[PDB]
Every structure is written in structure tokens, then in C-alpha cells.
Amino acid sequence: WGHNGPEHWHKDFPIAKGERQSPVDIDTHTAKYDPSLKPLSVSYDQATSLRILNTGYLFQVEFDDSQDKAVLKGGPLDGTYRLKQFHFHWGSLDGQGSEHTVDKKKYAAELHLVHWNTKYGDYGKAVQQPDGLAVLGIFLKVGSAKPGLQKVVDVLDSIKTKGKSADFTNFDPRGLLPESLDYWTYPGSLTTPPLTECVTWIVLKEPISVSSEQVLKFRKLNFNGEGEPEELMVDNWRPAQPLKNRQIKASFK
């Protein structure tokens, strides 16, 4: 999988045609304000980043999730979700790259901060539960630079190819958040195989702005390993999937 794009994944993972697949188009006019959504709590003051890795499909920054350092709580969530890693999906052009869309609009990229429900003890147990993960999704549009992103961009040359990693300590993910925490939420899935339906998605309404030069540097990563023909790492997003009977709730309006 990666002739092997998202339209093929159902043959190995039949849940690809399931009832709670992600991403989805967020129709802002049909999302329902839910005044009962409890306040969202993003507590990242003790986050401990470890490493950055080129997985062959995207890059990710991993955290020490062996204690409750950085956690997500509140909003639609019951209980405590620990930050495990963040990663991005992005496009070959500035008008595509996000996984979720808003009124059919695609953004240049989307940041996913992935958290697992600590009641399940480990993330591998959490991924087999309907409420195992909470992913905070943040859109990226191209405009002014994002200062809090530059440390990540500057390390990408050291993880150009599949399977490279590098130390990535002391990175503060708070620098990647927009001002507002207004959000939409809905039940969905992972967006790559095995596509399991274990995610409570929380998608922030306010995008962050990143510079043309920052996203250009995402696009110089490679899907291939070292010493293999170069395939630029672009368009690593899954398109919107049918919403089926689901309701998207809004925390605002």
C-alpha cells in the first residue's frame, strides 16, 4: 500500500468501506453546535519529544508517552489521552494536502497530534477500541511562516529517506497550535491501513499559517529509501470518505 493508493486499500483492509471512515468533508452548515461539549484541555507543558522519523509515507515526531506528560482531555472525550506523536500530511501544490476538508476546501497540509486513551494501558490495545485514540487535527494554509514549525523543517534534510530517524528532543508542540481551540468532532478512523475505527477526531477550525518555504521543504522528503530511485514525498493524504450516518458536532456558534 502507499498502483497502491487509497483506492486499493479495501482489498487488504475491507474496513476501508466501513461505516466510520476518515477523513471526511466537514459541511460547516450541517455541523451542529453542541452546547454540552465540555471545555477542551490541551496540556502540553511537560511534553518530552524524542525523535523524528521518516516512515516512508510521512514524517512523525515521537514523544515519551510512558507517563502522563502531555495529555488531551475534555471536549467530547471521557478520560485522559496521552500524546504519542504528531505528523503531517501534505500536497504537491498549495491547494491540496489536507485529509479533512471544510465545505470541500482543501488546505496545503494537515497536522495530526495523536493521543491514546490511558485506560487501555498501551497504544496497541487502544487502537483496537472504538474510543482508543483522539487525534487533534490542525489545517495548514500557506502564508506567513510558522516560527514554531521551523525546528521541524530544519531537521528534515537529516531524515530525507524512508527509515531515517534523528534525535528530536526539547521540541514544544504548543508552538504548532492556532490561537483558538474552537473545533469540530466526529467518530472516525485511522487514515492509513489498517484503517481501524478507533479515533475520536477533533479538528480545529482555525488553520495555522506556514510559509511557502516551509511546505517546500516537506516536499523535498522522499518516499524511497536511501540508494533507491527518488520518489518525492507529496500527496500523502487520503481523500474524504462517506459520512454515512454520522453527525459532526461543533464546539462553537
Ligand SMILES: NS(=O)(=O)c1c(F)c(F)c(SCCO)c(F)c1NC1CCCCCCC1
Ligand atoms: N492519520 S493517522 O493518525 O491514521 C496516521 C497515518 F495516516 C499515517 F500514514 C501514519 S505513518 C504509517 C503508519 O505507520 C501514522 F503513523 C498515523 N498515525 C499513527 C498514530 C500512532 C499509533 C496509532 C496507529 C496509527 C498510526
Ligand SMILES: [Zn+2]
Ligand atoms: Zn494522520
